[PDB]
Amino acid sequence: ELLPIELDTLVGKGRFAEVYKAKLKQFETVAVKIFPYEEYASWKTEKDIFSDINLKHENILQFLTAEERKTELGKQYWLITAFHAKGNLQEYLTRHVISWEDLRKLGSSLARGIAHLHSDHTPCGRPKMPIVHRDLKSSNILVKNDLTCCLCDFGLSLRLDPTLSVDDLANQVGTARYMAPEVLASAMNLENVESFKQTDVYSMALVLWEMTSRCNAVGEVKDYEPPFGSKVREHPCVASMADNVLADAGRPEIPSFWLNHQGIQMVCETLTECWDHDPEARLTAQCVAERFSEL
Ligand SMILES: COc1ccc(-c2c(-c3ccnc(NC(C)=O)c3)[nH]c3cccnc23)cn1
Ligand SMILES: [Mg+2]
């Protein structure tokens, strides 16, 4: 029943699991995400999301199967997917300076992926369960060979099920650096689940800024730095982030010279709307995808 897999190299580490490059005898290269028994609930959450036939999309990591693997001293829970050699976006931007064409491809594919995740329908019209990521960041966005993005790392994700209770939506997850000001404030408007989609758009705005910051179309490009890199610790707490994002209304810097390029100007204007203090003022991911198609 178990696939003939040989693990090769540890390539990543997520919040709940380690990620390995592996060989699948058929040999095809695959990614194997390994969850220890104590993170079973996160393995089950990701398995449930990936098992929905309505999720499959070019900008969502291609899922193969889930497995339970007995070890000599316990049991592991695996998820096996396609492997993207270029790896995660944070590392890609750290190592590379990207072109305007690259930024267009990466930014538009990220917006299309989030719009699909949030959608209550498939691209054809069938009802689909909307999903909110809740921990979107450059380190868990994958770069495909054709320089388009694909999403993964759904352990904190929420299926927007009509059965969700108010006492269930209110029980501060995710990466502090990428938390929207209402998340840092514990001020999410729980009267509508649309509040959760708005938090993903904020995090997406920070990632679009990271991509823009490494785009040679502006001319002189600085070495990559995470959003708020010089303002807070390497692993900042919610309090230090709230000092910046909420109290100081702080956002990553957009130097005026970047706006000299017509394309960069449009991207900067769009991502600025997406990181507005007011979640209701942000554009939707679908709006952002449309803005990119207009370029
Ligand atoms: C459902 O199963 C999976 C399996 C792997 C990942 C996954 C990968 C991943 C995927 C494909 N190719 C690569 N390739 C290189 C070079 O890293 C890395 N990177 C991650 C970083 C954080 C969390 N999850 C991941 C996510 N879900
Ligand atoms: Mg635990």
Tab-separated table of C-alpha atoms and ligand atoms in Angstrom:
chain	number	residue	atom	x	y	z
A	1	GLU	CA	0.000	0.000	0.000
A	2	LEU	CA	2.948	2.333	0.843
A	3	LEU	CA	4.736	3.980	-2.106
A	4	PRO	CA	8.368	2.941	-2.818
A	5	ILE	CA	10.053	6.137	-1.560
A	6	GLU	CA	13.696	6.793	-0.648
A	7	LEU	CA	14.329	10.029	1.315
A	8	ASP	CA	17.315	12.023	0.005
A	9	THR	CA	17.811	15.445	1.623
A	10	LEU	CA	16.165	17.672	4.268
A	11	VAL	CA	15.148	20.728	2.178
A	12	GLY	CA	12.790	22.563	4.503
A	13	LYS	CA	11.154	22.892	7.848
A	14	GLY	CA	7.605	24.068	8.339
A	15	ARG	CA	5.778	24.965	11.508
A	16	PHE	CA	4.654	21.335	12.087
A	17	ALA	CA	6.800	19.136	9.838
A	18	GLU	CA	10.147	18.589	8.123
A	19	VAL	CA	10.301	18.547	4.297
A	20	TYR	CA	12.511	16.147	2.306
A	21	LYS	CA	13.480	15.806	-1.331
A	22	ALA	CA	12.799	12.095	-2.123
A	23	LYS	CA	12.843	9.554	-4.958
A	24	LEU	CA	9.618	7.740	-5.881
A	25	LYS	CA	10.265	4.416	-7.717
A	26	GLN	CA	8.017	4.172	-10.831
A	27	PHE	CA	12.267	7.365	-10.486
A	28	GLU	CA	10.331	10.667	-10.026
A	29	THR	CA	11.500	13.375	-7.569
A	30	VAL	CA	8.859	14.210	-4.942
A	31	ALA	CA	8.639	16.275	-1.740
A	32	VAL	CA	7.787	14.397	1.455
A	33	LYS	CA	6.448	16.376	4.416
A	34	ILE	CA	6.926	14.436	7.659
A	35	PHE	CA	4.797	15.097	10.711
A	36	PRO	CA	5.568	13.434	14.075
A	37	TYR	CA	2.638	11.794	15.924
A	38	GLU	CA	2.219	14.893	18.188
A	39	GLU	CA	1.397	17.044	15.053
A	40	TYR	CA	-1.216	14.549	13.781
A	41	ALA	CA	-3.938	17.285	13.874
A	42	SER	CA	-1.920	19.486	11.449
A	43	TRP	CA	-1.256	16.475	9.151
A	44	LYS	CA	-5.047	15.789	9.187
A	45	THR	CA	-5.920	19.457	8.498
A	46	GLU	CA	-3.530	19.549	5.454
A	47	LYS	CA	-4.665	16.075	4.227
A	48	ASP	CA	-8.338	17.241	4.418
A	49	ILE	CA	-7.640	20.420	2.442
A	50	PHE	CA	-5.509	18.667	-0.227
A	51	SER	CA	-8.084	15.822	-0.551
A	52	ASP	CA	-10.795	18.248	-1.718
A	53	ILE	CA	-11.112	17.663	-5.547
A	54	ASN	CA	-12.128	21.386	-5.897
A	55	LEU	CA	-8.753	22.613	-4.605
A	56	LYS	CA	-6.543	21.377	-7.545
A	57	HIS	CA	-5.175	24.453	-9.357
A	58	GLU	CA	-1.916	25.400	-11.086
A	59	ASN	CA	-1.058	27.742	-8.189
A	60	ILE	CA	-1.688	25.147	-5.436
A	61	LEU	CA	1.025	22.556	-4.721
A	62	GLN	CA	0.194	19.290	-6.538
A	63	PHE	CA	-0.763	16.633	-3.967
A	64	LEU	CA	-0.064	12.920	-4.550
A	65	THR	CA	-1.125	11.106	-1.325
A	66	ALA	CA	-0.992	10.908	2.493
A	67	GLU	CA	0.617	7.960	4.339
A	68	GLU	CA	1.008	6.598	7.862
A	69	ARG	CA	4.503	5.268	8.418
A	70	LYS	CA	5.453	3.030	11.330
A	71	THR	CA	9.070	3.621	12.464
A	72	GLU	CA	11.173	1.364	14.773
A	73	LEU	CA	10.419	3.684	17.761
A	74	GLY	CA	7.010	5.176	16.786
A	75	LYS	CA	4.952	6.421	13.857
A	76	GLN	CA	5.227	9.346	11.369
A	77	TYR	CA	2.510	10.866	9.139
A	78	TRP	CA	3.564	11.814	5.607
A	79	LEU	CA	2.200	14.006	2.817
A	80	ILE	CA	3.780	13.485	-0.618
A	81	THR	CA	3.625	16.109	-3.402
A	82	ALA	CA	5.331	17.347	-6.526
A	83	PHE	CA	8.852	18.768	-5.900
A	84	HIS	CA	9.836	22.297	-6.988
A	85	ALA	CA	13.643	22.482	-7.351
A	86	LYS	CA	13.734	26.313	-7.118
A	87	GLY	CA	12.290	26.035	-3.600
A	88	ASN	CA	10.680	28.698	-1.496
A	89	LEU	CA	10.236	32.326	-2.502
A	90	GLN	CA	12.133	33.814	0.480
A	91	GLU	CA	15.274	31.831	-0.445
A	92	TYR	CA	14.752	32.541	-4.167
A	93	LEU	CA	14.604	36.335	-3.563
A	94	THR	CA	17.598	36.065	-1.201
A	95	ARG	CA	19.743	34.500	-3.953
A	96	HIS	CA	18.355	36.295	-7.019
A	97	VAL	CA	17.598	39.762	-8.416
A	98	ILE	CA	14.451	39.388	-10.534
A	99	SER	CA	13.354	41.088	-13.746
A	100	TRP	CA	10.108	43.024	-14.356
A	101	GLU	CA	8.758	40.018	-16.374
A	102	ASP	CA	9.655	37.750	-13.369
A	103	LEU	CA	7.831	40.109	-10.908
A	104	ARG	CA	4.750	40.161	-13.202
A	105	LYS	CA	4.689	36.308	-13.330
A	106	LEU	CA	5.340	35.772	-9.600
A	107	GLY	CA	2.989	38.491	-8.347
A	108	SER	CA	0.084	37.642	-10.666
A	109	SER	CA	0.331	33.875	-9.922
A	110	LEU	CA	0.408	34.537	-6.142
A	111	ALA	CA	-2.770	36.734	-6.416
A	112	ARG	CA	-4.466	34.079	-8.626
A	113	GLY	CA	-3.570	31.317	-6.110
A	114	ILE	CA	-4.967	33.262	-3.106
A	115	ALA	CA	-8.098	34.279	-5.094
A	116	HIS	CA	-8.655	30.558	-5.899
A	117	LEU	CA	-8.103	29.517	-2.261
A	118	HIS	CA	-10.665	32.170	-1.110
A	119	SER	CA	-13.208	31.368	-3.818
A	120	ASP	CA	-16.612	29.841	-3.108
A	121	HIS	CA	-16.580	28.370	-6.660
A	122	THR	CA	-14.272	26.447	-8.995
A	123	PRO	CA	-12.960	28.254	-12.172
A	124	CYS	CA	-15.910	26.547	-14.019
A	125	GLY	CA	-18.753	27.377	-11.548
A	126	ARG	CA	-19.209	24.477	-9.083
A	127	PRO	CA	-19.491	25.369	-5.323
A	128	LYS	CA	-16.139	25.142	-3.510
A	129	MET	CA	-15.267	25.402	0.163
A	130	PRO	CA	-13.371	28.769	0.643
A	131	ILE	CA	-10.093	28.340	2.533
A	132	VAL	CA	-8.160	31.010	4.447
A	133	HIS	CA	-4.389	30.307	4.652
A	134	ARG	CA	-3.719	32.140	8.008
A	135	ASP	CA	0.100	31.880	7.765
A	136	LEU	CA	1.044	33.205	4.317
A	137	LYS	CA	4.666	34.317	3.952
A	138	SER	CA	7.530	34.150	1.440
A	139	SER	CA	9.078	31.103	3.177
A	140	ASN	CA	6.060	28.871	2.356
A	141	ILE	CA	5.342	30.088	-1.207
A	142	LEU	CA	7.011	27.835	-3.781
A	143	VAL	CA	8.662	28.909	-7.019
A	144	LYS	CA	7.829	26.661	-9.984
A	145	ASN	CA	10.363	26.210	-12.827
A	146	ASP	CA	8.357	28.691	-15.000
A	147	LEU	CA	8.674	31.396	-12.272
A	148	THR	CA	5.037	31.227	-11.150
A	149	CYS	CA	4.047	30.683	-7.468
A	150	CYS	CA	2.243	27.883	-5.816
A	151	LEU	CA	0.776	27.757	-2.308
A	152	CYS	CA	1.224	25.189	0.452
A	153	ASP	CA	1.576	24.840	4.276
A	154	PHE	CA	-2.058	24.660	5.294
A	155	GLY	CA	-1.641	23.443	8.907
A	156	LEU	CA	-3.208	26.631	10.359
A	157	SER	CA	-5.679	27.047	7.492
A	158	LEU	CA	-9.389	27.306	8.012
A	159	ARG	CA	-12.080	25.889	5.767
A	160	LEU	CA	-14.831	28.581	5.981
A	161	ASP	CA	-17.438	25.982	7.062
A	162	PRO	CA	-20.943	27.296	7.873
A	163	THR	CA	-20.690	25.200	11.105
A	164	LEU	CA	-17.855	27.469	12.447
A	165	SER	CA	-18.789	29.024	15.830
A	166	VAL	CA	-17.827	32.540	17.114
A	167	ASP	CA	-16.161	30.752	20.107
A	168	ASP	CA	-14.215	28.720	17.439
A	169	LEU	CA	-13.037	31.669	15.231
A	170	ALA	CA	-11.717	33.406	18.425
A	171	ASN	CA	-9.481	30.390	19.377
A	172	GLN	CA	-3.629	34.634	17.593
A	173	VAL	CA	-2.043	32.098	15.237
A	174	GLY	CA	0.553	32.572	12.550
A	175	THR	CA	3.870	34.337	12.045
A	176	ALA	CA	3.974	37.653	13.966
A	177	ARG	CA	6.012	39.438	11.258
A	178	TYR	CA	3.193	38.872	8.690
A	179	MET	CA	0.202	39.471	10.983
A	180	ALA	CA	-2.302	42.124	9.916
A	181	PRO	CA	-2.791	45.057	12.397
A	182	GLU	CA	-6.266	43.728	13.430
A	183	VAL	CA	-4.652	40.316	14.204
A	184	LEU	CA	-1.900	41.987	16.295
A	185	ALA	CA	-4.643	44.080	18.021
A	186	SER	CA	-6.933	41.006	18.674
A	187	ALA	CA	-9.558	43.173	16.889
A	188	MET	CA	-10.682	40.824	14.100
A	189	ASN	CA	-14.340	41.423	13.201
A	190	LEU	CA	-15.781	37.995	13.918
A	191	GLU	CA	-19.298	39.032	12.667
A	192	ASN	CA	-18.146	37.820	9.185
A	193	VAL	CA	-15.537	35.230	8.050
A	194	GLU	CA	-14.550	37.769	5.322
A	195	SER	CA	-12.300	39.165	8.078
A	196	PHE	CA	-10.035	36.100	7.652
A	197	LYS	CA	-9.687	36.594	3.850
A	198	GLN	CA	-8.670	40.222	4.551
A	199	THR	CA	-5.814	39.038	6.834
A	200	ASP	CA	-4.446	36.828	4.000
A	201	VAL	CA	-4.534	39.863	1.641
A	202	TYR	CA	-2.460	41.892	4.136
A	203	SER	CA	0.183	39.105	4.323
A	204	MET	CA	0.089	38.818	0.508
A	205	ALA	CA	0.824	42.641	0.317
A	206	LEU	CA	4.038	42.120	2.366
A	207	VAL	CA	5.109	39.277	0.040
A	208	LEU	CA	4.418	41.453	-3.061
A	209	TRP	CA	6.639	44.117	-1.422
A	210	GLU	CA	9.416	41.473	-0.939
A	211	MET	CA	9.232	40.552	-4.644
A	212	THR	CA	9.221	44.266	-5.687
A	213	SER	CA	12.235	45.002	-3.397
A	214	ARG	CA	14.354	42.543	-5.422
A	215	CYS	CA	13.233	43.642	-8.864
A	216	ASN	CA	15.987	45.325	-11.008
A	217	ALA	CA	13.250	47.394	-12.812
A	218	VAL	CA	13.794	49.988	-10.011
A	219	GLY	CA	17.534	50.087	-10.840
A	220	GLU	CA	19.660	49.788	-7.679
A	221	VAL	CA	18.466	46.826	-5.571
A	222	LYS	CA	19.404	46.267	-1.902
A	223	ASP	CA	20.240	42.832	-0.460
A	224	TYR	CA	17.095	40.951	0.473
A	225	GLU	CA	15.676	41.655	3.927
A	226	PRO	CA	12.394	40.316	5.381
A	227	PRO	CA	9.539	42.839	5.932
A	228	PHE	CA	10.471	44.985	9.023
A	229	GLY	CA	13.928	43.291	9.028
A	230	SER	CA	15.874	46.084	10.750
A	231	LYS	CA	12.992	47.166	13.054
A	232	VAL	CA	12.424	43.989	15.142
A	233	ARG	CA	14.263	40.784	16.345
A	234	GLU	CA	14.841	37.763	13.971
A	235	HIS	CA	11.834	36.013	15.613
A	236	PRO	CA	9.722	39.015	16.767
A	237	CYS	CA	6.977	38.832	19.341
A	238	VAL	CA	3.459	40.141	18.717
A	239	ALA	CA	4.159	43.185	21.031
A	240	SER	CA	7.135	44.448	19.008
A	241	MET	CA	5.203	43.933	15.762
A	242	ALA	CA	2.149	45.804	17.125
A	243	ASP	CA	4.505	48.766	18.020
A	244	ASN	CA	5.370	49.004	14.329
A	245	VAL	CA	2.305	47.898	12.372
A	246	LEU	CA	-0.502	49.084	14.626
A	247	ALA	CA	0.846	51.915	16.897
A	248	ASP	CA	3.266	53.506	14.332
A	249	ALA	CA	1.088	52.489	11.248
A	250	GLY	CA	4.438	51.166	9.942
A	251	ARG	CA	4.897	49.298	6.669
A	252	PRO	CA	7.998	48.272	4.649
A	253	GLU	CA	9.580	51.254	2.880
A	254	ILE	CA	8.732	52.075	-0.742
A	255	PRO	CA	11.475	54.594	-1.855
A	256	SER	CA	10.086	57.259	-4.278
A	257	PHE	CA	12.564	56.238	-7.062
A	258	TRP	CA	10.808	52.820	-7.375
A	259	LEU	CA	7.715	54.698	-8.710
A	260	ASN	CA	9.670	55.981	-11.799
A	261	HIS	CA	8.866	52.607	-13.516
A	262	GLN	CA	5.137	52.561	-14.631
A	263	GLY	CA	4.761	48.832	-13.823
A	264	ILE	CA	6.472	49.070	-10.388
A	265	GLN	CA	4.218	52.119	-9.655
A	266	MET	CA	1.043	50.052	-10.311
A	267	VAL	CA	2.396	47.157	-8.138
A	268	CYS	CA	3.285	49.556	-5.271
A	269	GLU	CA	-0.115	51.310	-5.432
A	270	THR	CA	-1.888	47.893	-5.389
A	271	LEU	CA	0.063	46.341	-2.511
A	272	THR	CA	-0.354	49.664	-0.512
A	273	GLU	CA	-4.171	49.301	-0.759
A	274	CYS	CA	-3.734	45.644	0.322
A	275	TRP	CA	-1.927	46.580	3.572
A	276	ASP	CA	-4.397	49.289	4.642
A	277	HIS	CA	-5.009	49.475	8.419
A	278	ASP	CA	-8.762	48.992	7.685
A	279	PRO	CA	-9.393	45.349	6.479
A	280	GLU	CA	-12.537	46.494	4.662
A	281	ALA	CA	-10.448	49.006	2.594
A	282	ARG	CA	-8.115	46.296	1.254
A	283	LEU	CA	-8.559	44.976	-2.267
A	284	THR	CA	-9.611	41.314	-2.609
A	285	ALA	CA	-7.096	38.813	-4.019
A	286	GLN	CA	-9.323	38.600	-7.163
A	287	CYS	CA	-8.989	42.467	-7.551
A	288	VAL	CA	-5.205	42.103	-7.345
A	289	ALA	CA	-5.210	39.294	-9.991
A	290	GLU	CA	-7.292	41.632	-12.255
A	291	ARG	CA	-4.858	44.533	-11.692
A	292	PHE	CA	-2.002	42.221	-12.773
A	293	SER	CA	-3.879	41.080	-15.923
A	294	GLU	CA	-4.254	44.814	-16.843
A	295	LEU	CA	-0.392	45.216	-16.882
B	1	LIG	C1	1.555	18.592	1.461
B	1	LIG	O1	2.930	18.236	1.268
B	1	LIG	C2	3.848	19.222	1.226
B	1	LIG	C3	5.169	18.839	0.905
B	1	LIG	C4	6.132	19.841	0.888
B	1	LIG	C5	5.777	21.151	1.233
B	1	LIG	C6	6.772	22.228	1.433
B	1	LIG	C7	7.867	22.555	0.651
B	1	LIG	C8	8.363	22.030	-0.638
B	1	LIG	C9	7.483	21.470	-1.572
B	1	LIG	C10	7.961	21.171	-2.837
B	1	LIG	N1	9.234	21.400	-3.235
B	1	LIG	C11	10.089	21.912	-2.332
B	1	LIG	N2	11.409	22.155	-2.839
B	1	LIG	C12	12.473	22.714	-2.200
B	1	LIG	C13	13.740	22.827	-3.012
B	1	LIG	O2	12.447	23.111	-1.053
B	1	LIG	C14	9.697	22.224	-1.013
B	1	LIG	N3	8.539	23.610	1.244
B	1	LIG	C15	7.877	23.972	2.397
B	1	LIG	C16	8.154	24.957	3.343
B	1	LIG	C17	7.297	25.066	4.438
B	1	LIG	C18	6.222	24.180	4.537
B	1	LIG	N4	5.937	23.238	3.625
B	1	LIG	C19	6.771	23.147	2.567
B	1	LIG	C20	4.447	21.400	1.569
B	1	LIG	N5	3.477	20.461	1.550
B	2	MG	MG	1.628	20.198	20.388
